[PDB]
Amino acid sequence: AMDKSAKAPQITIFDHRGCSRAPKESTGGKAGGQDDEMMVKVASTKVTVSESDAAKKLQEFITFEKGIDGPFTSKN
Amino acid sequence: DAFSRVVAAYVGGADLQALKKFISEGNKRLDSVNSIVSNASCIVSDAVSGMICENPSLISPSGNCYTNRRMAACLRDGEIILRYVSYALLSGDASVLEDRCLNGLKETYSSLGVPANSNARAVSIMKACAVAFVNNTASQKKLSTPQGDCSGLASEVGGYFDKVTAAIS
Amino acid sequence: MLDAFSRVVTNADSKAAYVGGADLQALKKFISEGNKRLDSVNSIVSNASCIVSDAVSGMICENPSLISPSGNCYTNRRMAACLRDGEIILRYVSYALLSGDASVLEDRCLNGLKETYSSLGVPANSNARAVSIMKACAVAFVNNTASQKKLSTPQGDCSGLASEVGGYFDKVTAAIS
Amino acid sequence: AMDKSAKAPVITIFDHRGCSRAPKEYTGAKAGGKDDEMMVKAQSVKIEVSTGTAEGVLATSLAKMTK
Ligand SMILES: *C(=C)C1=C(C)C(=O)N/C1=C\c1[nH]c(/C=C2\N=C(C[C@H]3NC(=O)C(C=C)=C3C)C(C)=C2CCC(=O)O)c(CCC(=O)O)c1C
Ligand SMILES: *C(=C)C1=C(C)C(=O)N/C1=C\c1[nH]c(/C=C2\N=C(C[C@H]3NC(=O)C(C=C)=C3C)C(C)=C2CCC(=O)O)c(CCC(=O)O)c1C
Ligand SMILES: *C(=C)C1=C(C)[C@@H](Cc2[nH]c(/C=C3N=C(/C=C4\NC(=O)[C@H](C)[C@H]4[C@@H](*)C)C(C)=C\3CCC(=O)O)c(CCC(=O)O)c2C)NC1=O
Ligand SMILES: *C(=C)C1=C(C)[C@@H](Cc2[nH]c(/C=C3N=C(/C=C4\NC(=O)[C@H](C)[C@H]4[C@@H](*)C)C(C)=C\3CCC(=O)O)c(CCC(=O)O)c2C)NC1=O
Ligand SMILES: *[C@@H](C)[C@H]1/C(=C/C2=NC(=C\c3[nH]c(C[C@H]4NC(=O)C(C=C)=C4C)c(C)c3CCC(=O)O)/C(CCC(=O)O)=C2C)NC(=O)[C@@H]1C
Ligand SMILES: *[C@@H](C)[C@H]1/C(=C/C2=NC(=C\c3[nH]c(C[C@H]4NC(=O)C(C=C)=C4C)c(C)c3CCC(=O)O)/C(CCC(=O)O)=C2C)NC(=O)[C@@H]1C
Ligand SMILES: *[C@H](C)[C@H]1/C(=C/C2=NC(=C\c3[nH]c(C[C@H]4NC(=O)C(C=C)=C4C)c(C)c3CCC(=O)O)/C(CCC(=O)O)=C2C)NC(=O)[C@@H]1C
Ligand SMILES: *[C@H](C)[C@H]1/C(=C/C2=NC(=C\c3[nH]c(C[C@H]4NC(=O)C(C=C)=C4C)c(C)c3CCC(=O)O)/C(CCC(=O)O)=C2C)NC(=O)[C@@H]1C
Ligand SMILES: [Cl-]
Ligand SMILES: [Mg+2]
Ligand SMILES: [Mg+2]
């Protein structure tokens, strides 16, 4: 059941082949190849949006502009 | 099993090699997931903005996004929904999406008065976003992905959005 | 000068100023290209969060050391300050585009800015790349050559205003580089 | 001079031609046409960025960078 906690999977995909920051977070050893420089991280974290951040977004939204992608579908 | 326990898990090296043996099209699948997750802020913003510009009464004093408190909850919910869809695509399965995000969600939204036609439109704009990111045809593109066909993965993520739509409409 | 915004631009108070109706009619003949100019400002400021976030994330993917433990965007505090500065600069550029004059941008944003960044160790090469990405975003929103269906405005040629806003970003680049 | 206040001019362009919500904030003279349904607002505002936003940009940057 949807448990009302506002927690959801937080994914980070690190394709860091060639990255000079050495990997130190894996736990299952080495593949002996480029999987050793890549990682998928999954956490369960509460999603939160502050009221001040929502006020910033409303000031953008209220003028009925858009990004590059998509059709313009506003009638205002 | 590791991601199941979580839903942090840090899957790299041999564990990542193993992970890509148990999900279909593992390398393409992780490209597809990253194309959505790394662009999630613009996806949620564009979907809520587009919901509102098609129906500006949502931010009038009688609308369900009125007040910063309600707008914040709506932006949050868009991100929660996109996260569960993204995780469905990462796992290749809808079971956590159904159990932890969708089961009970319509009943909650009905009690709250969160407008289902508006919600369906936010979800539909997120779906269009995610399809274009998977196929790398959004206006912001990844530069150096090996060329090939990810229409199967784009169809699969479309199906996860459709489960959301069906549950809440 | 836009007289209604005189107290806005000197930070003399926090009161909103409003230009509508006959005051707006007169504003659009005081500035040039009035309707297109206001459309251009609208398309930039309504996308401000994404322009700034894309510019800072792009600065960082080109130079990942910025969020290494020794980098100037490391920690939420430093990242927030950098995003904040990106928005401050974008907004002063948007005011130059609104008024058709760089004076407030030069006087209230750029004058003394490089010396502040020098004192703090805010890396000018990286700052210049954040500004150049924001510039590229603004030019694409203003001179958007997609079909009418994808535009929020009646189709026409806004390359002039795109060049103008480009020159205001170039004043930022020259001041801080 | 740059006064270190972190304030900037926040501009909001309200072109609300055809809008059923009546204009009220602007109390100056009327134009007698579509300019009475449109307004430029400007305000000196301290620009603030949240920890959540900073965390989101950090996550985007890590996911998009490669080497
Ligand atoms: C290369 C890109 C980078 C340059 C150049 C640079 O200066 N920093 C670079 C990368 C970078 N990585 C992190 C942090 C994390 N990276 C991982 C993923 C890797 N860990 C592994 O074990 C493997 C594979 C086996 C990886 C691939 C993770 C888990 C972290 C920790 C952060 C997190 O989000 O969990 C940073 C952040 C600063 C730091 O920790 O060094 C940077 C900038
Ligand atoms: C039409 C679009 C709308 C429909 C349909 C609807 O339900 N609400 C719509 C619009 C709407 N406007 C506001 C708020 C403000 N509008 C202005 C600008 C107008 N005021 C004027 O005096 C003139 C011209 C002379 C305008 C054009 C202003 C300044 C505001 C106040 C808020 C601001 O951000 O400063 C809203 C918000 C809710 C409300 O106040 O009604 C909406 C949804
Ligand atoms: C790291 C891998 C990395 C990035 C992150 C990315 C950064 C980057 N972005 C551009 C250019 C643009 N970004 C735009 C932004 C937006 N468009 C929208 O529709 C939304 C609302 C908003 C936020 C995403 C725009 C309009 C542009 C300009 C068009 C174009 O794509 O170029 C650049 C190019 C900058 C340049 O031209 O100098 C870069 C570097 N790129 C990455 O590499
Ligand atoms: C209100 C005036 C208004 C909107 C806001 C806008 C809403 C809208 N957006 C789409 C489609 C897409 N949006 C995308 C988003 C992004 N692309 C990027 O490059 C950045 C990072 C990000 C944020 C802006 C994308 C990828 C799409 C799909 C594009 C394509 O298919 O190639 C639509 C269409 C939704 C539909 O098809 O059902 C709409 C309406 N339009 C407005 O009028
Ligand atoms: C649709 C998604 C894209 C498309 C994707 C393709 N990606 C291909 C290969 C490939 N991708 C990665 C990165 C991936 N694997 C990882 O483990 C992680 C991170 C943890 C990620 C982000 C790898 C390693 C590879 C293999 C090739 C390589 O060495 O780089 C791919 C080629 C086919 C295949 O491998 O199945 C394709 C088609 N390509 C497209 O054109 C659409 C837009
Ligand atoms: C580049 C900027 C755009 C582009 C812009 C065009 N806008 C045109 C006309 C137009 N725009 C407005 C709205 C404007 N006037 C205001 O007073 C306010 C807010 C206070 C705004 C946001 C009006 C009222 C008009 C004129 C009436 C109308 O045509 O609707 C326009 C056509 C006229 C001209 O060419 O001068 C253009 C070309 N067009 C584009 O393609 C790029 C993306
Ligand atoms: C945005 C596109 C919507 C919109 C959304 C609103 N949602 C509000 C509250 C709310 N949402 C949830 C579901 C959420 N919590 C979870 O734990 C998960 C999944 C694991 C999800 C998807 C809950 C349980 C609640 C109520 C409790 C809470 O606020 O945290 C809401 C606030 C309503 C109210 O307070 O008046 C809004 C505004 N509103 C819209 O108009 C569009 C369609
Ligand atoms: C982002 C693209 C940069 C970056 C930015 C940093 N800026 C930091 C501090 C700082 N910035 C300003 C200028 C700002 N305040 C103003 O009032 C105005 C204009 C009117 C502007 C443009 C000042 C005065 C300060 C110091 C005081 C303050 O932070 O309030 C900063 C350090 C923050 C901290 O450690 O707390 C950073 C990180 N850093 C980057 O790496 C890129 C290039
Ligand atoms: Cl774009
Ligand atoms: Mg408009
Ligand atoms: Mg001067």
PDB file of C-alpha atoms in Angstrom, chain B:
ATOM      1  CA  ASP B   1      17.832  -8.355  -3.590  1.00  0.00           C
ATOM      2  CA  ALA B   2      19.917  -5.352  -2.514  1.00  0.00           C
ATOM      3  CA  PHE B   3      17.609  -2.783  -4.128  1.00  0.00           C
ATOM      4  CA  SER B   4      14.576  -4.652  -2.774  1.00  0.00           C
ATOM      5  CA  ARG B   5      15.860  -4.356   0.796  1.00  0.00           C
ATOM      6  CA  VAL B   6      16.341  -0.627   0.311  1.00  0.00           C
ATOM      7  CA  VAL B   7      13.109   0.279  -1.456  1.00  0.00           C
ATOM      8  CA  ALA B   8      21.559   2.888   0.460  1.00  0.00           C
ATOM      9  CA  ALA B   9      22.605   0.161  -1.968  1.00  0.00           C
ATOM     10  CA  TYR B  10      25.847   0.776  -3.874  1.00  0.00           C
ATOM     11  CA  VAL B  11      26.041  -1.593  -6.845  1.00  0.00           C
ATOM     12  CA  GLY B  12      29.327  -1.311  -8.765  1.00  0.00           C
ATOM     13  CA  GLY B  13      32.043  -3.589 -10.158  1.00  0.00           C
ATOM     14  CA  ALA B  14      31.152  -7.282 -10.063  1.00  0.00           C
ATOM     15  CA  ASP B  15      27.801  -6.525  -8.402  1.00  0.00           C
ATOM     16  CA  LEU B  16      26.893  -4.308 -11.368  1.00  0.00           C
ATOM     17  CA  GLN B  17      28.047  -6.988 -13.811  1.00  0.00           C
ATOM     18  CA  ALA B  18      25.678  -9.356 -11.971  1.00  0.00           C
ATOM     19  CA  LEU B  19      22.854  -6.802 -11.991  1.00  0.00           C
ATOM     20  CA  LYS B  20      22.990  -6.505 -15.794  1.00  0.00           C
ATOM     21  CA  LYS B  21      22.662 -10.291 -16.125  1.00  0.00           C
ATOM     22  CA  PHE B  22      19.224 -10.251 -14.443  1.00  0.00           C
ATOM     23  CA  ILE B  23      17.621  -7.271 -16.183  1.00  0.00           C
ATOM     24  CA  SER B  24      16.987  -7.254 -19.944  1.00  0.00           C
ATOM     25  CA  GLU B  25      19.217  -5.078 -22.120  1.00  0.00           C
ATOM     26  CA  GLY B  26      21.192  -4.035 -19.056  1.00  0.00           C
ATOM     27  CA  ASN B  27      23.477  -1.387 -20.554  1.00  0.00           C
ATOM     28  CA  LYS B  28      20.737   0.268 -22.608  1.00  0.00           C
ATOM     29  CA  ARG B  29      18.391   0.061 -19.623  1.00  0.00           C
ATOM     30  CA  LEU B  30      20.802   1.978 -17.396  1.00  0.00           C
ATOM     31  CA  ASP B  31      21.280   4.611 -20.116  1.00  0.00           C
ATOM     32  CA  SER B  32      17.478   4.891 -20.297  1.00  0.00           C
ATOM     33  CA  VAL B  33      17.094   5.273 -16.541  1.00  0.00           C
ATOM     34  CA  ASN B  34      19.826   7.911 -16.330  1.00  0.00           C
ATOM     35  CA  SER B  35      18.221   9.890 -19.180  1.00  0.00           C
ATOM     36  CA  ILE B  36      15.079  10.263 -17.054  1.00  0.00           C
ATOM     37  CA  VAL B  37      16.534  10.527 -13.547  1.00  0.00           C
ATOM     38  CA  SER B  38      19.291  13.028 -14.372  1.00  0.00           C
ATOM     39  CA  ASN B  39      16.692  15.283 -16.037  1.00  0.00           C
ATOM     40  CA  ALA B  40      13.983  14.789 -13.411  1.00  0.00           C
ATOM     41  CA  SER B  41      13.812  18.426 -12.263  1.00  0.00           C
ATOM     42  CA  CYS B  42      12.945  19.742 -15.716  1.00  0.00           C
ATOM     43  CA  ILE B  43      10.541  16.832 -16.313  1.00  0.00           C
ATOM     44  CA  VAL B  44       8.550  17.563 -13.138  1.00  0.00           C
ATOM     45  CA  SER B  45       8.662  21.344 -13.629  1.00  0.00           C
ATOM     46  CA  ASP B  46       7.576  21.135 -17.274  1.00  0.00           C
ATOM     47  CA  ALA B  47       4.731  18.741 -16.441  1.00  0.00           C
ATOM     48  CA  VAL B  48       3.344  20.841 -13.574  1.00  0.00           C
ATOM     49  CA  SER B  49       3.837  24.060 -15.537  1.00  0.00           C
ATOM     50  CA  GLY B  50       2.061  22.526 -18.529  1.00  0.00           C
ATOM     51  CA  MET B  51      -0.789  21.190 -16.357  1.00  0.00           C
ATOM     52  CA  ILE B  52      -1.247  24.712 -15.033  1.00  0.00           C
ATOM     53  CA  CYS B  53      -0.867  26.585 -18.328  1.00  0.00           C
ATOM     54  CA  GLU B  54      -3.579  24.362 -19.825  1.00  0.00           C
ATOM     55  CA  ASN B  55      -5.799  25.044 -16.782  1.00  0.00           C
ATOM     56  CA  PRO B  56      -4.821  28.212 -14.908  1.00  0.00           C
ATOM     57  CA  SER B  57      -7.690  27.804 -12.403  1.00  0.00           C
ATOM     58  CA  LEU B  58      -5.381  25.329 -10.600  1.00  0.00           C
ATOM     59  CA  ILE B  59      -3.512  28.337  -9.162  1.00  0.00           C
ATOM     60  CA  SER B  60      -6.607  30.507  -8.626  1.00  0.00           C
ATOM     61  CA  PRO B  61      -7.783  30.756  -5.010  1.00  0.00           C
ATOM     62  CA  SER B  62     -10.159  27.811  -5.551  1.00  0.00           C
ATOM     63  CA  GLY B  63      -7.566  25.659  -7.340  1.00  0.00           C
ATOM     64  CA  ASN B  64      -5.774  22.680  -5.831  1.00  0.00           C
ATOM     65  CA  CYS B  65      -2.293  24.157  -6.292  1.00  0.00           C
ATOM     66  CA  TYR B  66      -3.209  27.417  -4.519  1.00  0.00           C
ATOM     67  CA  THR B  67      -0.843  28.386  -1.690  1.00  0.00           C
ATOM     68  CA  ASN B  68       2.849  27.512  -1.536  1.00  0.00           C
ATOM     69  CA  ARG B  69       1.966  24.577   0.729  1.00  0.00           C
ATOM     70  CA  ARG B  70      -0.245  22.928  -1.891  1.00  0.00           C
ATOM     71  CA  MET B  71       2.037  23.729  -4.821  1.00  0.00           C
ATOM     72  CA  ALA B  72       4.924  22.176  -2.867  1.00  0.00           C
ATOM     73  CA  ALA B  73       2.914  18.993  -2.289  1.00  0.00           C
ATOM     74  CA  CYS B  74       2.044  18.814  -5.989  1.00  0.00           C
ATOM     75  CA  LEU B  75       5.637  19.308  -7.164  1.00  0.00           C
ATOM     76  CA  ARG B  76       6.654  16.709  -4.591  1.00  0.00           C
ATOM     77  CA  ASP B  77       4.069  14.193  -5.815  1.00  0.00           C
ATOM     78  CA  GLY B  78       5.203  14.648  -9.426  1.00  0.00           C
ATOM     79  CA  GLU B  79       8.755  13.815  -8.346  1.00  0.00           C
ATOM     80  CA  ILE B  80       7.583  10.847  -6.221  1.00  0.00           C
ATOM     81  CA  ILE B  81       5.655   9.437  -9.181  1.00  0.00           C
ATOM     82  CA  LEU B  82       8.590   9.934 -11.556  1.00  0.00           C
ATOM     83  CA  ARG B  83      10.918   8.233  -9.060  1.00  0.00           C
ATOM     84  CA  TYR B  84       8.723   5.146  -8.799  1.00  0.00           C
ATOM     85  CA  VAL B  85       8.408   4.978 -12.609  1.00  0.00           C
ATOM     86  CA  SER B  86      12.183   5.333 -12.918  1.00  0.00           C
ATOM     87  CA  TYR B  87      12.696   2.527 -10.413  1.00  0.00           C
ATOM     88  CA  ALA B  88      10.239   0.331 -12.338  1.00  0.00           C
ATOM     89  CA  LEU B  89      12.426   0.837 -15.413  1.00  0.00           C
ATOM     90  CA  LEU B  90      15.604   0.180 -13.410  1.00  0.00           C
ATOM     91  CA  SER B  91      14.175  -3.056 -12.000  1.00  0.00           C
ATOM     92  CA  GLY B  92      12.325  -4.123 -15.157  1.00  0.00           C
ATOM     93  CA  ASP B  93       9.178  -4.721 -13.111  1.00  0.00           C
ATOM     94  CA  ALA B  94       6.069  -2.891 -11.873  1.00  0.00           C
ATOM     95  CA  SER B  95       5.639  -4.610  -8.505  1.00  0.00           C
ATOM     96  CA  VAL B  96       7.062  -1.861  -6.252  1.00  0.00           C
ATOM     97  CA  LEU B  97       5.355   0.803  -8.380  1.00  0.00           C
ATOM     98  CA  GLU B  98       2.029  -0.955  -7.840  1.00  0.00           C
ATOM     99  CA  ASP B  99       2.493  -1.891  -4.179  1.00  0.00           C
ATOM    100  CA  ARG B 100       4.215   1.206  -2.780  1.00  0.00           C
ATOM    101  CA  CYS B 101       3.053   4.050  -5.039  1.00  0.00           C
ATOM    102  CA  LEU B 102      -0.256   3.198  -6.705  1.00  0.00           C
ATOM    103  CA  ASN B 103      -2.173   0.933  -4.294  1.00  0.00           C
ATOM    104  CA  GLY B 104      -4.422   3.254  -2.288  1.00  0.00           C
ATOM    105  CA  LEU B 105      -3.351   6.394  -4.162  1.00  0.00           C
ATOM    106  CA  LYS B 106      -6.650   7.119  -5.902  1.00  0.00           C
ATOM    107  CA  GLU B 107      -8.501   6.790  -2.583  1.00  0.00           C
ATOM    108  CA  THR B 108      -6.131   9.306  -1.010  1.00  0.00           C
ATOM    109  CA  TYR B 109      -6.519  11.744  -3.879  1.00  0.00           C
ATOM    110  CA  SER B 110     -10.312  11.365  -3.836  1.00  0.00           C
ATOM    111  CA  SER B 111     -10.430  12.161  -0.113  1.00  0.00           C
ATOM    112  CA  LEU B 112      -8.144  15.176  -0.545  1.00  0.00           C
ATOM    113  CA  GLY B 113      -9.898  16.554  -3.619  1.00  0.00           C
ATOM    114  CA  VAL B 114      -6.775  16.367  -5.799  1.00  0.00           C
ATOM    115  CA  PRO B 115      -8.238  16.784  -9.293  1.00  0.00           C
ATOM    116  CA  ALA B 116      -7.825  13.586 -11.316  1.00  0.00           C
ATOM    117  CA  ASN B 117      -8.014  15.128 -14.814  1.00  0.00           C
ATOM    118  CA  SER B 118      -5.274  17.628 -13.931  1.00  0.00           C
ATOM    119  CA  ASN B 119      -3.194  14.874 -12.316  1.00  0.00           C
ATOM    120  CA  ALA B 120      -3.611  12.695 -15.419  1.00  0.00           C
ATOM    121  CA  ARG B 121      -2.306  15.572 -17.548  1.00  0.00           C
ATOM    122  CA  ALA B 122       0.785  16.076 -15.346  1.00  0.00           C
ATOM    123  CA  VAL B 123       1.489  12.359 -15.706  1.00  0.00           C
ATOM    124  CA  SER B 124       0.952  12.448 -19.476  1.00  0.00           C
ATOM    125  CA  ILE B 125       3.409  15.319 -19.896  1.00  0.00           C
ATOM    126  CA  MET B 126       5.958  13.405 -17.787  1.00  0.00           C
ATOM    127  CA  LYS B 127       5.372  10.370 -20.042  1.00  0.00           C
ATOM    128  CA  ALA B 128       6.108  12.383 -23.184  1.00  0.00           C
ATOM    129  CA  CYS B 129       9.241  13.740 -21.532  1.00  0.00           C
ATOM    130  CA  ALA B 130      10.473  10.293 -20.539  1.00  0.00           C
ATOM    131  CA  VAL B 131       9.869   8.770 -23.989  1.00  0.00           C
ATOM    132  CA  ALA B 132      11.939  11.492 -25.636  1.00  0.00           C
ATOM    133  CA  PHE B 133      14.761  11.152 -23.089  1.00  0.00           C
ATOM    134  CA  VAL B 134      14.916   7.381 -23.589  1.00  0.00           C
ATOM    135  CA  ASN B 135      15.115   7.799 -27.363  1.00  0.00           C
ATOM    136  CA  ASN B 136      17.493  10.784 -26.947  1.00  0.00           C
ATOM    137  CA  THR B 137      15.240  13.127 -28.923  1.00  0.00           C
ATOM    138  CA  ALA B 138      14.586  15.718 -26.217  1.00  0.00           C
ATOM    139  CA  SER B 139      15.934  19.231 -26.846  1.00  0.00           C
ATOM    140  CA  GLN B 140      18.745  18.505 -24.378  1.00  0.00           C
ATOM    141  CA  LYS B 141      20.553  15.411 -25.626  1.00  0.00           C
ATOM    142  CA  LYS B 142      23.254  13.103 -24.364  1.00  0.00           C
ATOM    143  CA  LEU B 143      26.180  13.478 -26.727  1.00  0.00           C
ATOM    144  CA  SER B 144      28.013  10.161 -26.907  1.00  0.00           C
ATOM    145  CA  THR B 145      25.690   7.148 -26.517  1.00  0.00           C
ATOM    146  CA  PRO B 146      26.356   4.227 -28.867  1.00  0.00           C
ATOM    147  CA  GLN B 147      23.717   4.418 -31.588  1.00  0.00           C
ATOM    148  CA  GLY B 148      20.983   1.790 -31.533  1.00  0.00           C
ATOM    149  CA  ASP B 149      17.294   1.188 -31.005  1.00  0.00           C
ATOM    150  CA  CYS B 150      15.757   1.733 -27.585  1.00  0.00           C
ATOM    151  CA  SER B 151      12.147   1.695 -28.718  1.00  0.00           C
ATOM    152  CA  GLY B 152      11.511  -1.447 -26.578  1.00  0.00           C
ATOM    153  CA  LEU B 153      12.672   0.376 -23.455  1.00  0.00           C
ATOM    154  CA  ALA B 154      10.695   3.481 -24.453  1.00  0.00           C
ATOM    155  CA  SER B 155       7.598   1.294 -24.785  1.00  0.00           C
ATOM    156  CA  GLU B 156       8.299  -0.325 -21.417  1.00  0.00           C
ATOM    157  CA  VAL B 157       8.579   3.015 -19.612  1.00  0.00           C
ATOM    158  CA  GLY B 158       5.418   4.189 -21.404  1.00  0.00           C
ATOM    159  CA  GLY B 159       3.649   1.184 -19.856  1.00  0.00           C
ATOM    160  CA  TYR B 160       4.725   2.217 -16.345  1.00  0.00           C
ATOM    161  CA  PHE B 161       3.299   5.715 -16.887  1.00  0.00           C
ATOM    162  CA  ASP B 162       0.089   4.100 -18.178  1.00  0.00           C
ATOM    163  CA  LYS B 163      -0.209   2.123 -14.936  1.00  0.00           C
ATOM    164  CA  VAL B 164      -0.059   5.438 -13.061  1.00  0.00           C
ATOM    165  CA  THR B 165      -2.719   6.970 -15.316  1.00  0.00           C
ATOM    166  CA  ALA B 166      -5.012   3.961 -14.910  1.00  0.00           C
ATOM    167  CA  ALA B 167      -4.646   4.007 -11.131  1.00  0.00           C
ATOM    168  CA  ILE B 168      -5.426   7.703 -10.605  1.00  0.00           C
ATOM    169  CA  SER B 169      -7.733   8.775 -13.436  1.00  0.00           C
TER     170      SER B 169
END
